[PDB]
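Components:
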Amino acid sequence: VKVGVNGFGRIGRLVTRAAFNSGKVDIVAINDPFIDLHYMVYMFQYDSTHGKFHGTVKAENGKLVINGKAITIFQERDPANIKWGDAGATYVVESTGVFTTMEKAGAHLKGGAKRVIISAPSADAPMFVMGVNHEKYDNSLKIVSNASCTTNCLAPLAKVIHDHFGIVEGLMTTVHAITATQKTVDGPSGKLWRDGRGAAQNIIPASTGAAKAVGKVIPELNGKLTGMAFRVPTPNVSVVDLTCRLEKPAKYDDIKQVVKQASEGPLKGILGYTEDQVVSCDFNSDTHSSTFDAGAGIALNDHFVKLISWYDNEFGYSNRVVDLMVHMASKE
Amino acid sequence: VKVGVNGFGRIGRLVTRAAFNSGKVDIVAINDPFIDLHYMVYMFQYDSTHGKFHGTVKAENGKLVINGKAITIFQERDPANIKWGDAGATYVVESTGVFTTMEKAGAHLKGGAKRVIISAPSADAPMFVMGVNHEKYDNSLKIVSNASCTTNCLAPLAKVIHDHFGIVEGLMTTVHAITATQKTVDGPSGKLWRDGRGAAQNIIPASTGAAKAVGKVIPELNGKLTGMAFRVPTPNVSVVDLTCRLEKPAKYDDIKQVVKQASEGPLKGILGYTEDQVVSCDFNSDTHSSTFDAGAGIALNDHFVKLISWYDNEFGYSNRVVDLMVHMASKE
Amino acid sequence: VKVGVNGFGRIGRLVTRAAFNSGKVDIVAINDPFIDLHYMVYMFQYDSTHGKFHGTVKAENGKLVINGKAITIFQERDPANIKWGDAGATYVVESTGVFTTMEKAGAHLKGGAKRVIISAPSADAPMFVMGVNHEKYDNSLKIVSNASCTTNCLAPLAKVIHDHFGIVEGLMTTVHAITATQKTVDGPSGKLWRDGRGAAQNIIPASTGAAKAVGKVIPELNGKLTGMAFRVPTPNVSVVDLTCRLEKPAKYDDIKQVVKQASEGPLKGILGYTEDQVVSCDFNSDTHSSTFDAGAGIALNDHFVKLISWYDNEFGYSNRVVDLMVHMASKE
Amino acid sequence: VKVGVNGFGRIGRLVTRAAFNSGKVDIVAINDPFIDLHYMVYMFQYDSTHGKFHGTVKAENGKLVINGKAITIFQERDPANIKWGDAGATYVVESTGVFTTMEKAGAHLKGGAKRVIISAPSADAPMFVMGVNHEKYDNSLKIVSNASCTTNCLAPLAKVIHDHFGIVEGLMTTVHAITATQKTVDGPSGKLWRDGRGAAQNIIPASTGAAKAVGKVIPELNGKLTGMAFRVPTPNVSVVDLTCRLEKPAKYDDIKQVVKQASEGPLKGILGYTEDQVVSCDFNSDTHSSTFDAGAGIALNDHFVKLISWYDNEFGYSNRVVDLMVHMASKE
Ligand SMILES: NC(=O)c1ccc[n+]([C@@H]2O[C@H](COP(=O)([O-])OP(=O)(O)OC[C@H]3O[C@@H](n4cnc5c(N)ncnc54)[C@H](O)[C@@H]3O)[C@@H](O)[C@H]2O)c1
Ligand SMILES: NC(=O)c1ccc[n+]([C@@H]2O[C@H](COP(=O)([O-])OP(=O)(O)OC[C@H]3O[C@@H](n4cnc5c(N)ncnc54)[C@H](O)[C@@H]3O)[C@@H](O)[C@H]2O)c1
Ligand SMILES: NC(=O)c1ccc[n+]([C@@H]2O[C@H](COP(=O)([O-])OP(=O)(O)OC[C@H]3O[C@@H](n4cnc5c(N)ncnc54)[C@H](O)[C@@H]3O)[C@@H](O)[C@H]2O)c1
Ligand SMILES: NC(=O)c1ccc[n+]([C@@H]2O[C@H](COP(=O)([O-])OP(=O)(O)OC[C@H]3O[C@@H](n4cnc5c(N)ncnc54)[C@H](O)[C@@H]3O)[C@@H](O)[C@H]2O)c1
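Structure:
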């Protein structure tokens, strides 16, 4: 399938890296009004977090050429003015953070594209998570969402645990790395005041919808989960801390067995498992959605427990975008 | 009342700063084999976290003089070889991290001191927390402990909540700043392998006894609490995240009213209260033990809730050491 | 004397802090289209780098009131649409970073202000540096500039050394803390590509005009100095490293004596001197423009030498703005 | 040639990585009293800066097995008690930082080893630098030194420039990343006071012998160079800033040509060259000793210039150790 990209940021660029890594998806066009053709070369070649690109990159005849495949470049602010059709782009990835409703994202179809994928949650487009509800996707749907990074970590874990023991109620905290909507020194952040204070200096509390959204993707758990977040001064990689009460009694060692079996069968590639003494930098550029840390958790008794799971928020999420589009294309 | 210090580190120096500010406690001797007389002047004058000392500091006749008070300096590795009595030291503060049992800390009395206070938890000496059980102290006790920084934050908050609504069960996480037992780059750390990885780079999980210890200080809650910790890259100030279940039903607003009343009456100076949009740097050099953040917490139901409280782990703890010794002395 | 502020950022707010502390300058109006009235209270009360404000701050009748003085608030993007005169603002401080030429800054006079001071270098307005050329100011000048933070550190030091021994030639490097034009993660930065890479992760080279500009402020040194900069991951405080060649021979001790004498006489308050073992945090909220570090420098010969000087780039500069306006007003 | 390692730290472990990468050197024994057999596996597998080892690692029959080669493990404090001979170790790498003179390092020959290489400067063993004086090595010599990380960056650059234009005099500064002799919070550091202040918080000045040592390795430049250092809060990668005066006149573009030619001929693999807009993270795990940055430097005139060169202090240096031992072995 042939693909386009709107917004060449952290997610936009890493999705592009992943597609050339696989060879199931082919990238044929890119739009970003604030990055010119020569500046694109530089930003794709060099990366502070994940390292130099292994391959070749240059500019020839007004196009971007990676490993020898030529790509068409555009520079528009309004999405209705982009000529996707002429270039041959059948699916579009929307990753600017500015167009997350159905009305707004709809503008792409006007330029001659078939379907659109939003790289964030949505107030009204239907949400999917690979491993959990992806089989509910249908070819009547022209606009869809891949949810948030945090929701892709929490959802696979809660499904296994709910199926085998049963969840009565629960509360979540995430300790999360820094992103591009934060600030270097104290400053203006609009309506959300704590989010504008110095990012290199502070621990910062913040809101999250990620836990209530599990209830859309798993109906049975609707109304039984919620949570919050802290932002801390590391540049990539994050962690989930889930505290919950169970229906059926369960020793800690029984919980471990069930999680390892799922990682070796149906959820291979998505949910991992480990007993080593790891820390955050050990998961930099890891491709899983969720990895269970067996040593770091604890139980008060047979009905009340605390569980711990790690995730690369940039590079894990990027690879789930590509997987989603492949599934979709097999149902055309 | 006149006092001695064994260990001139982060706690040892800041206790000394607090006592000169207050003026009920008087410091008359100091022991540290690794810091000579001229080096002591430099370390007390300048501080990276809390700033310059306002006052005068100099060296005269082989003694350390601050605002005109002369202090006797010693350099011994073995605590039994030290002559406290001769210098006139009636209480000793033990803050080296190496002598935390009753056998080991007992050596100070062989040198002619009356009573000893350990600045950390203990396997066998009795523990106290101002505001919670300090009225159970009595004259027969020669060796005592002031517990940990985390236990001084959690204990006051749980006593209010247990008294008014009742705690059935609960689980705790603390997000904590870096300390002097960590390492600048990957290296050896003994039995705890995760503790030696790079402190400037990582989020690091670790164990903590601070929640079980609440059960010794408040007998009724023995066996109903436990928890863990993460270490993150800030130089000072930490936070508690308590998830718990209640006996009597309670709306969020009712919980707020009960906490504000306690802060304004019998726990004034120990427990604070706030509704402003705060972050970690806002509590640097604050003197409270625990401050409730009303905006950051959340409730699932009338029986299931998440509560949030801040603490300066260096400077809050230092001031509680001083308060304890005053109580003690006024009962001799 | 009564004054206005256009741009309530890091400099705009700290100038305001300095004036209330001193008491010769009085603030009566403030303009910032992106910070509303209630948001202003919060940003002035709490500060990550310098700490809480000691005083009272509140909102009453649509005006901002600090220790009982009411201030008029405006919200305009175009500086010509602003009514300075009506509020009683005789001088205006221009600290947005967007209006640094004479055409552009001229718009403030159309609103009824007398004189304007630009808080940055300028292509065409005349530049002044207290201690060096401030006595050349005169009444005919309606628009002026206070130069950059780096130029206020270098200029006083070079004038002493040129007067006593003579400078043939020289080259400068500054190691500088992070500012608000940098980025949290890899991203777009216009014409300067290196400036947009992750600020928490990297050492970053950049250009600076600060050394050539010394040649406008001291005509005799025109064409004999230039330099560059590196940006590093601290939140405040910077350092100068000057390498130079001399006309008259000079031992290191002779250089020290000449610098101490100037600090104790005609440059008191501007140029400091020290022989203690200092580091960067020791100068946080210091009010000098330049402090000579005697231990850190070194000489190859009696004609070839390396000199080292520290500066608080936020709070030192803020106090020089206030001093300039006093001089000006006492000559009306 | 068969090789042993004393001190399994940052350098000790990365040298071991490099030798299995090449296949010119074979590692057969390791000594470290503070890291037991099972702890060695963990520290070699996982790395915060350079990433997971690509290969296999396990423990079998009391030995360490990497990619299937078995290695003998020892646990001694005194180097005279190690049985190098029995294990078959013909050369020994000394990387503890405690044994840097000829007397002290001599103890290894008593255990039955042939020659020793010190991974640091030395008060009396003879020093070498690949690319510059390695051809002066002789088979009469039993104990030798590979100099410091900084000296391996400066020396190759100064040789090219001195040969083509001539150096009359010069002064150096290095901006340098953090290491394991620093501290997480303010504390005791012995005789060097600034070196014990908080490493995550400050810019710290320090001494260096690296520039005078160039005069041993290049006799003609003895007495014409010296310098100093700043330490800053990044975990790896450093930079050199050399300011110097020339004999023969030279335009900037002439200096560039000469440096590029040397990088493509005799000094290929040791000295690099670049015109792109790079920053520090772009050189993480780079194998060169010195890379010239052409955009970042500047000239005041035809006789007076400032030059800039980057270096991975951990991973560049490690690969030069291995190269030295190969050369040596060809002269047996
Ligand atoms: N950073 C993460 O870990 C992460 C994880 C999951 C989801 N996301 C989501 O992905 C989106 C972007 O995240 P990001 O981290 O890549 O931000 P980013 O700033 O790194 O990237 C955004 C890009 O959008 C471009 N852009 C802006 N306006 C545009 C327009 N009108 N037309 C075309 N291009 C435009 C910018 O030039 C920029 O390159 C957000 O909605 C975010 O919620 C981020
Ligand atoms: N920093 C905190 O958050 C905190 C809070 C509460 C309690 N504590 C506890 O206080 C104790 C001290 O902590 P710190 O943070 O000051 O550590 P630190 O390393 O800053 O201080 C320890 C000091 O003890 C000295 N020392 C070592 N051996 C000695 C001996 N034989 N005689 C005299 N002095 C000796 C060292 O030179 C050093 O000055 C620890 O047990 C710690 O757990 C720390
Ligand atoms: N921080 C330093 O070290 C330093 C030192 C000396 C000089 N300066 C200079 O001072 C100037 C301001 O610097 P800063 O560090 O406070 O930046 P900042 O971003 O902290 O402050 C800029 C402020 O200007 C406001 N602004 C933008 N457009 C405006 C408009 N039309 N009207 C009114 N306000 C507007 C923003 O909301 C913001 O509050 C810059 O030119 C900078 O170069 C900075
Ligand atoms: N870090 C760098 O960038 C760098 C660069 C060039 C040279 N060096 C030099 O290499 C040496 C070590 O540097 P490092 O960064 O690897 O320090 P490190 O702490 O990382 O490694 C030192 C190791 O020595 C072991 N050790 C200590 N005493 C011992 C003994 N008696 N016997 C056996 N083993 C012992 C320790 O257990 C530790 O593993 C120093 O001399 C340093 O100057 C370092």
